[PDB]
């Protein structure tokens, strides 16, 4: 019925008419030069899609996809390997036309068969959540350059997400299981190719100079550097010192003390290094500490509420962090879907049927993480923590909390990446000790952190909840019970309340008017159950770089736009 060259999850695509290049690029940007970047931890293989292993920097971008997303919109799709698509009004089937000029790096064509092969490969050797999400979906080459996708139930976002699948060359991947790590880079297709590396230490990408899609609208003014090099550092302090010394070119500064007090010295005086701070109005990544609620120590909501009360954010922000941070308080932070007011009538129609299985505060209060006076030793909050612990059966015997029936101490392990700056850890450990709670600290390397995060082999560990601009069907992978082993369910929660709210969200894909009370209602359930302990976020981007680059006039809303930068040989000439 319909045929289009652009798509959007909600509303209309911004570049629907006369699309020559994005607003946030310089179409005339020159090619050449190197950018060197840091990475924290280590890596051991090149397959981002395997069941295990520690994949190298940028290995999620080795392959082009059927459509690609703009960076100044939440979810709009524009042609890459595909030229266009025909589709049913409900998006339950689509026929994708493949660009006949599309090529892998060895010069061979990308065909409809490669896409069909790619879907079956993920279905049979991929991450276990893929065959669950696309249960009943088929992907079939119906012509040499036409792929037909059919969904067994309506899912406009699930359809559009298949446009982001990497398109694998069958001629290489027929000889490699998708679940196995790769010691060597696979045959690929994107604008940059791995050309050298040292296992665990560096990866070098080279610009593909005859890249078949270099002049497509989505690519104009992007992929300008001839070389992108990643050097690995074991902790962020030595990385920050290497940046100041000139060892790499660009730093995203996530430490408040570094920004407030350490952007000093010869290289800043002579303006060799540029420091930039821009406010950011869009959806925000948030930091949390995950409670593993499958372990007895964190199975009681009252214990999780009490440990949250012991986390003195106002003191940390004032005494340690130069008042730089804002407190995390939503799984839809800084969007319309955050539950920052009282439930309206539409939300109550969604929530009231489940009042038996909900904390009563969902209906009567706005969720607010604990606030202290910032002086330290908050009497009100620590008295309330004691009150909740006693009710849950953890009582003081001597100086240590002990189960009132068994007599087993209240004790747990905080699992920590050795690479992180963790100035907040000892203050939190001290506050818990004053409640009689023992928290052991275990710092481990990047490979053990990845292995144990995936298997949930922890009592508590830090987790980042990525920015979610609308209530996406991805939510089921992180929260719904059948996806408990996807590696994205940090607390280990299997709740029929969550499941019903997310099943309604998945049934309303692409329908904003109904996703709005659904998202706010889900936010209330996730926050009021204290599945995780809210830390902090900042709505500004703090960046610094050596002055060898120039940038477009406009920065994209949803990323920093580094792939639109270029090497400026006049500015570079002025550096030592």
């Amino acid at each position: 019925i319909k045929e289009s060259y652009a798509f959007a999850v909600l509303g209309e695509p911004r570049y629907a008419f006369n699309f020559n290049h994005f607003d946030y690029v310089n179409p005339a940007a020159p090619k050449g030069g190197q950018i060197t970047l840091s990475a924290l931890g280590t890596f051991d293989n090149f397959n981002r899609y395997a069941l295990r292993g520690n994949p190298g920097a940028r290995t999620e971008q080795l392959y082009d996809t059927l459509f690609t997303t703009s960076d100044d919109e939440p979810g709009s799709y524009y042609p890459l390997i595909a030229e266009s698509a025909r589709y049913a009004d409900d998006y339950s089937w689509v026929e994708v036309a493949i660009n006949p000029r599309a090529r892998f790096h060895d010069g061979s064509p990308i065909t409809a068969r490669d896409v069909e092969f790619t879907f079956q490969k993920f279905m049979t050797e991929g991450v276990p959540q893929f065959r669950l999400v696309y249960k009943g979906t088929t992907v079939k080459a119906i012509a040499p350059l036409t792929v037909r996708i059919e969904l067994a139930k309506p899912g406009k976002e699930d359809m559009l997400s298949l446009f982001s699948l990497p398109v694998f060359p069958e001629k290489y991947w027929k000889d490699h299981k998708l679940s196995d790590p790769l010691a060597t880079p696979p045959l690929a297709s994107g604008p940059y190719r791995v050309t050298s590396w040292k296992m665990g230490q560096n990866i070098v990408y080279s610009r593909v100079k005859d890249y078949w899609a270099a002049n497509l609208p989505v690519n104009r003014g992007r992929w300008n550097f001839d070389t992108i090099r990643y050097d690995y550092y074991l902790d962020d302090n030595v990385a920050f010192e290497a940046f100041k010394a000139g060892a790499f070119d660009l730093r995203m500064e996530n430490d408040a003390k570094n920004w407030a007090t350490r952007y000093t010295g010869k290289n800043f005086d002579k303006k060799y290094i540029i420091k930039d701070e821009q406010k950011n109005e869009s959806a925000q990544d948030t930091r949390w500490l995950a409670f593993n609620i499958q372990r007895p120590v964190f199975s009681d909501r009252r214990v999780r509420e009490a440990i949250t009360l012991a986390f003195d954010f106002e003191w940390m922000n004032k005494a340690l962090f130069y008042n730089a941070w804002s407190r995390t308080n939503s799984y839809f932070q800084n969007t319309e879907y955050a539950a920052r007011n009282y439930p309206d009538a539409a939300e109550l129609v969604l929530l009231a049927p489940m009042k038996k299985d909900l904390p009563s505060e969902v209906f009567t209060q706005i969720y607010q993480p604990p606030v202290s006076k910032g002086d330290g030793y908050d009497r009100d909050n620590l008295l309330k923590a004691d009150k909740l612990l006693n009710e849950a059966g953890w009582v003081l015997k001597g100086q240590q909390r002990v189960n009132a029936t068994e007599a087993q101490p209240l004790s747990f392990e905080l699992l920590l990446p050795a690479s992180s700056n963790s100035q907040w850890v000892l203050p939190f450990q001290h506050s818990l000790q004053r409640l009689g709670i023992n928290m052991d600290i275990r710092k481990v390397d990047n490979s053990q952190i990845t292995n144990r995060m995936r298997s949930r082999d922890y009592d508590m560990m830090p987790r980042v909840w990525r920015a979610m601009p609308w209530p996406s069907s991805d939510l089921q992978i992180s929260w719904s019970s059948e996806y408990i082993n996807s590696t994205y369910n940090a607390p280990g929660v299997q709740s029929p309340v969550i499941d019903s709210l997310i099943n309604q969200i998945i049934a309303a894909q692409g329908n904003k008017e109904k996703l709005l009370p659904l998202g706010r209602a889900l936010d209330r359930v996730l926050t009021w159950n204290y599945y995780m302990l809210p830390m902090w976020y900042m709505a500004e981007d703090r960046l610094a770089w050596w002055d060898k680059f120039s940038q477009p006039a406009v920065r994209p809303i949803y990323s920093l736009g580094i792939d639109t930068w270029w090497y400026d040989v006049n500015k570079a000439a002025k550096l030592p």
Partner: peptide, 7 residues
């Protein structure tokens, strides 16, 4: 994420 494990 439907195509890869957490990192």
């Amino acid at each position: 994420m439907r195509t890869g494990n957490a990192x």
